[PDB]
């Protein structure tokens, strides 16, 4: 089948007129079966989420959201590592990309993080990262 990259470029393609739920699903599926899967997938979303093109970032976030909802224990491991949390922080923090980032994209990320501190207490690093955004005042 198509590689993870090909799957993500379609799932987050700036030309999509609507969410490509098909290709998206295919993404969460494929990544959760390769040993190198999660780390790769995780690195790709990070880049997509930081795109200057909002629609490309919004879809990426939707993909991240989706794969996190499946019983993908492996995906939660990668997303739970600061190796990935830092990338989301760079997008919402003013000290980095936070300034040039759309309000829409930043608010979505904050909500995504919250929801995980709730349905995924098992992941402390997420709560840890989320907590820092609180102190900085990012979390109004």
């Amino acid at each position: 089948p198509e590689t993870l990259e090909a799957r993500i470029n379609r799932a987050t393609n700036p030309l999509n007129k609507e969410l490509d739920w098909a290709s998206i699903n295919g993404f969460c599926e494929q990544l959760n079966e390769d040993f190198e899967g999660p780390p790769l997938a995780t690195r790709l979303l990070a880049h997509k989420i930081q795109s200057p093109q909002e629609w490309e970032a919004i879809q990426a976030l939707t993909v991240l959201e989706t794969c996190m909802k499946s019983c993908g224990k492996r995906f939660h491991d990668e997303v739970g590592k600061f190796r990935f949390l830092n990338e989301l922080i760079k997008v919402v923090s003013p000290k980095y990309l936070g300034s040039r980032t759309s309000e829409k994209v930043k608010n979505k990320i904050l909500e995504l993080l919250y929801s995980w501190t709730v349905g995924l207490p098992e992941e402390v690093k997420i709560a840890e990262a989320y907590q820092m955004l609180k102190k900085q005042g990012i979390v109004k």
Partner: peptide, 7 residues
């Protein structure tokens, strides 16, 4: 292994 929390 994992990097530290960004500042």
């Amino acid at each position: 292994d994992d990097i530290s929390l960004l500042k």
